[PDB]
Amino acid sequence: NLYFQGKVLSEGEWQLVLHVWAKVEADVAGHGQDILIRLFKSHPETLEKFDRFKHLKTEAEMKASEDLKKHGVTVLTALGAILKKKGHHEAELKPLAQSHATKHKIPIKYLEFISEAIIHVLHSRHPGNFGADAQGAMNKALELFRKDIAAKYKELGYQG
């Protein structure tokens, strides 16, 4: 109801992003599993950033890992928080960039990898709310996020 002006994307575009995301969060453990599994299959190097379960090899192993399922929820709910700010996310990205550029060393290229994964799983599970316009909107939102976190990376001297 009560209007809340976002940035970069149009109100239209934000609404498309948020409507899909509501479907994601309605089954957040299931989507996070699909998305991380896709990420690890497509780009195995990323698996190393998770010490707690880099010993996983098969999909079946991935599906049974309660640590991987927990991290799927962490990443999706953090990203949902970010998207719901509709671009107003400087305070959210500060701590995220802090831990990611320092304690973890996650390069920008890897956020691109997970962006592709997110778009692939949403396209596959959501024909109703992830038509071409919703996917164009979601791509703009993730690009905005990656551009902004990269800038925070530069502020921290991290090559990125």
PDB file of C-alpha atoms in Angstrom:
ATOM      1  CA  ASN A   1       0.000   0.000   0.000  1.00  0.00           C
ATOM      2  CA  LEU A   2       1.985   3.058   1.339  1.00  0.00           C
ATOM      3  CA  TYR A   3       4.329   4.151  -1.479  1.00  0.00           C
ATOM      4  CA  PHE A   4       8.068   3.865  -0.958  1.00  0.00           C
ATOM      5  CA  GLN A   5      10.232   5.434  -3.671  1.00  0.00           C
ATOM      6  CA  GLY A   6      13.198   3.300  -4.773  1.00  0.00           C
ATOM      7  CA  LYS A   7      16.233   4.132  -6.964  1.00  0.00           C
ATOM      8  CA  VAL A   8      17.793   3.160 -10.327  1.00  0.00           C
ATOM      9  CA  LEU A   9      14.989   0.704 -11.222  1.00  0.00           C
ATOM     10  CA  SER A  10      11.424   2.001 -11.867  1.00  0.00           C
ATOM     11  CA  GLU A  11       8.593   1.301  -9.430  1.00  0.00           C
ATOM     12  CA  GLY A  12       7.344  -1.202 -12.033  1.00  0.00           C
ATOM     13  CA  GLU A  13      10.711  -3.016 -12.114  1.00  0.00           C
ATOM     14  CA  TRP A  14      10.990  -3.096  -8.323  1.00  0.00           C
ATOM     15  CA  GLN A  15       7.500  -4.558  -8.034  1.00  0.00           C
ATOM     16  CA  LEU A  16       8.493  -7.374 -10.403  1.00  0.00           C
ATOM     17  CA  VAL A  17      11.585  -8.127  -8.398  1.00  0.00           C
ATOM     18  CA  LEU A  18       9.669  -8.129  -5.119  1.00  0.00           C
ATOM     19  CA  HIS A  19       6.749 -10.262  -6.360  1.00  0.00           C
ATOM     20  CA  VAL A  20       9.095 -13.122  -7.434  1.00  0.00           C
ATOM     21  CA  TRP A  21      11.110 -12.782  -4.290  1.00  0.00           C
ATOM     22  CA  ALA A  22       7.973 -13.342  -2.222  1.00  0.00           C
ATOM     23  CA  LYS A  23       7.713 -16.764  -3.973  1.00  0.00           C
ATOM     24  CA  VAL A  24      11.404 -17.504  -3.281  1.00  0.00           C
ATOM     25  CA  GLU A  25      11.017 -16.765   0.443  1.00  0.00           C
ATOM     26  CA  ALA A  26       7.845 -18.824   0.674  1.00  0.00           C
ATOM     27  CA  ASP A  27      10.240 -21.830   0.122  1.00  0.00           C
ATOM     28  CA  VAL A  28      13.570 -20.340   1.023  1.00  0.00           C
ATOM     29  CA  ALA A  29      15.477 -23.545   2.019  1.00  0.00           C
ATOM     30  CA  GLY A  30      14.423 -25.200  -1.248  1.00  0.00           C
ATOM     31  CA  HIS A  31      15.435 -22.315  -3.482  1.00  0.00           C
ATOM     32  CA  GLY A  32      18.763 -21.805  -1.607  1.00  0.00           C
ATOM     33  CA  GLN A  33      19.557 -25.467  -2.136  1.00  0.00           C
ATOM     34  CA  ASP A  34      18.740 -25.289  -5.829  1.00  0.00           C
ATOM     35  CA  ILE A  35      20.705 -22.099  -6.271  1.00  0.00           C
ATOM     36  CA  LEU A  36      23.924 -23.125  -4.383  1.00  0.00           C
ATOM     37  CA  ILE A  37      23.903 -26.558  -5.991  1.00  0.00           C
ATOM     38  CA  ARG A  38      23.726 -24.964  -9.404  1.00  0.00           C
ATOM     39  CA  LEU A  39      26.493 -22.554  -8.421  1.00  0.00           C
ATOM     40  CA  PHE A  40      28.810 -25.363  -7.248  1.00  0.00           C
ATOM     41  CA  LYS A  41      28.161 -27.501 -10.385  1.00  0.00           C
ATOM     42  CA  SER A  42      28.709 -24.556 -12.784  1.00  0.00           C
ATOM     43  CA  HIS A  43      31.794 -23.137 -11.041  1.00  0.00           C
ATOM     44  CA  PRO A  44      33.397 -25.629  -8.596  1.00  0.00           C
ATOM     45  CA  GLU A  45      36.039 -23.135  -7.457  1.00  0.00           C
ATOM     46  CA  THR A  46      33.365 -21.281  -5.423  1.00  0.00           C
ATOM     47  CA  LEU A  47      32.875 -24.343  -3.253  1.00  0.00           C
ATOM     48  CA  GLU A  48      36.225 -23.623  -1.549  1.00  0.00           C
ATOM     49  CA  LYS A  49      34.901 -20.472   0.168  1.00  0.00           C
ATOM     50  CA  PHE A  50      32.814 -22.730   2.379  1.00  0.00           C
ATOM     51  CA  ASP A  51      35.215 -24.587   4.724  1.00  0.00           C
ATOM     52  CA  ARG A  52      32.359 -26.327   6.523  1.00  0.00           C
ATOM     53  CA  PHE A  53      31.395 -28.372   3.417  1.00  0.00           C
ATOM     54  CA  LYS A  54      34.008 -28.188   0.641  1.00  0.00           C
ATOM     55  CA  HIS A  55      34.333 -32.039   1.019  1.00  0.00           C
ATOM     56  CA  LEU A  56      30.950 -32.442  -0.800  1.00  0.00           C
ATOM     57  CA  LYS A  57      31.176 -33.828  -4.358  1.00  0.00           C
ATOM     58  CA  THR A  58      27.898 -35.362  -5.519  1.00  0.00           C
ATOM     59  CA  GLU A  59      24.511 -33.704  -5.761  1.00  0.00           C
ATOM     60  CA  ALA A  60      23.127 -36.267  -3.267  1.00  0.00           C
ATOM     61  CA  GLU A  61      25.853 -35.199  -0.809  1.00  0.00           C
ATOM     62  CA  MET A  62      24.906 -31.580  -1.441  1.00  0.00           C
ATOM     63  CA  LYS A  63      21.200 -32.303  -0.889  1.00  0.00           C
ATOM     64  CA  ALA A  64      21.936 -33.998   2.451  1.00  0.00           C
ATOM     65  CA  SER A  65      24.303 -31.377   3.829  1.00  0.00           C
ATOM     66  CA  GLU A  66      22.400 -29.482   6.529  1.00  0.00           C
ATOM     67  CA  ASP A  67      25.189 -26.880   6.514  1.00  0.00           C
ATOM     68  CA  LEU A  68      24.687 -26.166   2.803  1.00  0.00           C
ATOM     69  CA  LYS A  69      20.910 -25.875   3.295  1.00  0.00           C
ATOM     70  CA  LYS A  70      21.498 -23.417   6.192  1.00  0.00           C
ATOM     71  CA  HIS A  71      23.853 -21.295   4.078  1.00  0.00           C
ATOM     72  CA  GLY A  72      21.257 -21.251   1.295  1.00  0.00           C
ATOM     73  CA  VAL A  73      18.836 -19.609   3.717  1.00  0.00           C
ATOM     74  CA  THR A  74      21.515 -17.168   4.910  1.00  0.00           C
ATOM     75  CA  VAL A  75      22.375 -15.967   1.417  1.00  0.00           C
ATOM     76  CA  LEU A  76      18.797 -15.717   0.168  1.00  0.00           C
ATOM     77  CA  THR A  77      17.409 -13.895   3.231  1.00  0.00           C
ATOM     78  CA  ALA A  78      20.360 -11.441   3.187  1.00  0.00           C
ATOM     79  CA  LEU A  79      19.752 -10.775  -0.496  1.00  0.00           C
ATOM     80  CA  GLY A  80      15.992 -10.477   0.058  1.00  0.00           C
ATOM     81  CA  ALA A  81      16.630  -7.814   2.777  1.00  0.00           C
ATOM     82  CA  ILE A  82      18.780  -5.972   0.249  1.00  0.00           C
ATOM     83  CA  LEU A  83      16.272  -6.120  -2.596  1.00  0.00           C
ATOM     84  CA  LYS A  84      13.431  -4.916  -0.356  1.00  0.00           C
ATOM     85  CA  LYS A  85      15.333  -1.677   0.240  1.00  0.00           C
ATOM     86  CA  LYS A  86      14.793  -0.993  -3.492  1.00  0.00           C
ATOM     87  CA  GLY A  87      18.326   0.440  -3.918  1.00  0.00           C
ATOM     88  CA  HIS A  88      18.479   2.136  -0.451  1.00  0.00           C
ATOM     89  CA  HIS A  89      20.919  -0.423   0.865  1.00  0.00           C
ATOM     90  CA  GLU A  90      24.121   1.400   1.873  1.00  0.00           C
ATOM     91  CA  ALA A  91      23.730   0.421   5.508  1.00  0.00           C
ATOM     92  CA  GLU A  92      23.009  -3.227   4.624  1.00  0.00           C
ATOM     93  CA  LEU A  93      26.012  -3.498   2.272  1.00  0.00           C
ATOM     94  CA  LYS A  94      28.553  -2.042   4.715  1.00  0.00           C
ATOM     95  CA  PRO A  95      28.760  -5.065   7.076  1.00  0.00           C
ATOM     96  CA  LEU A  96      28.284  -7.414   4.075  1.00  0.00           C
ATOM     97  CA  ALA A  97      31.241  -5.915   2.191  1.00  0.00           C
ATOM     98  CA  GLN A  98      33.268  -5.832   5.491  1.00  0.00           C
ATOM     99  CA  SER A  99      33.011  -9.628   6.102  1.00  0.00           C
ATOM    100  CA  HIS A 100      33.179 -10.513   2.370  1.00  0.00           C
ATOM    101  CA  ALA A 101      36.219  -8.440   1.378  1.00  0.00           C
ATOM    102  CA  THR A 102      38.168  -9.245   4.577  1.00  0.00           C
ATOM    103  CA  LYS A 103      37.205 -12.425   6.430  1.00  0.00           C
ATOM    104  CA  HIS A 104      36.135 -14.312   3.271  1.00  0.00           C
ATOM    105  CA  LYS A 105      37.735 -12.693   0.189  1.00  0.00           C
ATOM    106  CA  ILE A 106      34.796 -13.201  -2.246  1.00  0.00           C
ATOM    107  CA  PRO A 107      35.677 -11.638  -5.692  1.00  0.00           C
ATOM    108  CA  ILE A 108      33.070  -9.750  -7.714  1.00  0.00           C
ATOM    109  CA  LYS A 109      33.268 -12.451 -10.413  1.00  0.00           C
ATOM    110  CA  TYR A 110      31.712 -14.867  -7.885  1.00  0.00           C
ATOM    111  CA  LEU A 111      28.697 -12.673  -7.200  1.00  0.00           C
ATOM    112  CA  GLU A 112      28.164 -12.661 -10.985  1.00  0.00           C
ATOM    113  CA  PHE A 113      28.283 -16.507 -10.910  1.00  0.00           C
ATOM    114  CA  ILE A 114      25.608 -16.606  -8.220  1.00  0.00           C
ATOM    115  CA  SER A 115      23.572 -14.004 -10.089  1.00  0.00           C
ATOM    116  CA  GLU A 116      23.405 -16.333 -13.123  1.00  0.00           C
ATOM    117  CA  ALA A 117      22.423 -19.197 -10.793  1.00  0.00           C
ATOM    118  CA  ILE A 118      19.613 -17.195  -9.152  1.00  0.00           C
ATOM    119  CA  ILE A 119      18.217 -16.173 -12.552  1.00  0.00           C
ATOM    120  CA  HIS A 120      18.461 -19.770 -13.847  1.00  0.00           C
ATOM    121  CA  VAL A 121      16.610 -21.276 -10.848  1.00  0.00           C
ATOM    122  CA  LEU A 122      13.897 -18.551 -10.810  1.00  0.00           C
ATOM    123  CA  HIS A 123      13.317 -18.925 -14.541  1.00  0.00           C
ATOM    124  CA  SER A 124      12.974 -22.654 -14.113  1.00  0.00           C
ATOM    125  CA  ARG A 125      10.621 -22.669 -11.137  1.00  0.00           C
ATOM    126  CA  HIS A 126       8.545 -19.522 -11.801  1.00  0.00           C
ATOM    127  CA  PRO A 127       6.912 -19.339 -15.296  1.00  0.00           C
ATOM    128  CA  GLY A 128       4.064 -17.286 -13.807  1.00  0.00           C
ATOM    129  CA  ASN A 129       6.146 -14.534 -12.211  1.00  0.00           C
ATOM    130  CA  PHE A 130       9.420 -14.728 -14.091  1.00  0.00           C
ATOM    131  CA  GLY A 131       8.544 -13.713 -17.683  1.00  0.00           C
ATOM    132  CA  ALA A 132      11.113 -11.817 -19.715  1.00  0.00           C
ATOM    133  CA  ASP A 133      10.276  -8.479 -18.078  1.00  0.00           C
ATOM    134  CA  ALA A 134      10.617  -9.818 -14.512  1.00  0.00           C
ATOM    135  CA  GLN A 135      14.012 -11.394 -15.472  1.00  0.00           C
ATOM    136  CA  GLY A 136      15.186  -8.091 -17.017  1.00  0.00           C
ATOM    137  CA  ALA A 137      14.150  -6.342 -13.797  1.00  0.00           C
ATOM    138  CA  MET A 138      15.853  -8.965 -11.643  1.00  0.00           C
ATOM    139  CA  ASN A 139      19.024  -8.657 -13.685  1.00  0.00           C
ATOM    140  CA  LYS A 140      19.022  -4.852 -13.181  1.00  0.00           C
ATOM    141  CA  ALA A 141      18.533  -5.310  -9.423  1.00  0.00           C
ATOM    142  CA  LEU A 142      21.410  -7.781  -9.105  1.00  0.00           C
ATOM    143  CA  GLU A 143      23.707  -5.621 -11.238  1.00  0.00           C
ATOM    144  CA  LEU A 144      22.882  -2.612  -9.011  1.00  0.00           C
ATOM    145  CA  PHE A 145      23.775  -4.760  -5.982  1.00  0.00           C
ATOM    146  CA  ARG A 146      27.062  -5.938  -7.539  1.00  0.00           C
ATOM    147  CA  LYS A 147      28.100  -2.440  -8.639  1.00  0.00           C
ATOM    148  CA  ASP A 148      27.408  -1.042  -5.141  1.00  0.00           C
ATOM    149  CA  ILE A 149      29.217  -3.760  -3.257  1.00  0.00           C
ATOM    150  CA  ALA A 150      32.217  -3.414  -5.620  1.00  0.00           C
ATOM    151  CA  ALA A 151      32.397   0.258  -4.754  1.00  0.00           C
ATOM    152  CA  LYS A 152      32.437  -0.671  -1.052  1.00  0.00           C
ATOM    153  CA  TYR A 153      35.229  -3.147  -1.917  1.00  0.00           C
ATOM    154  CA  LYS A 154      37.354  -0.312  -3.392  1.00  0.00           C
ATOM    155  CA  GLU A 155      36.803   1.766  -0.213  1.00  0.00           C
ATOM    156  CA  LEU A 156      38.346  -1.190   1.632  1.00  0.00           C
ATOM    157  CA  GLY A 157      41.363  -1.442  -0.684  1.00  0.00           C
ATOM    158  CA  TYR A 158      40.292  -4.981  -1.675  1.00  0.00           C
ATOM    159  CA  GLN A 159      41.393  -5.783  -5.225  1.00  0.00           C
ATOM    160  CA  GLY A 160      38.041  -7.571  -5.544  1.00  0.00           C
TER     161      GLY A 160
END
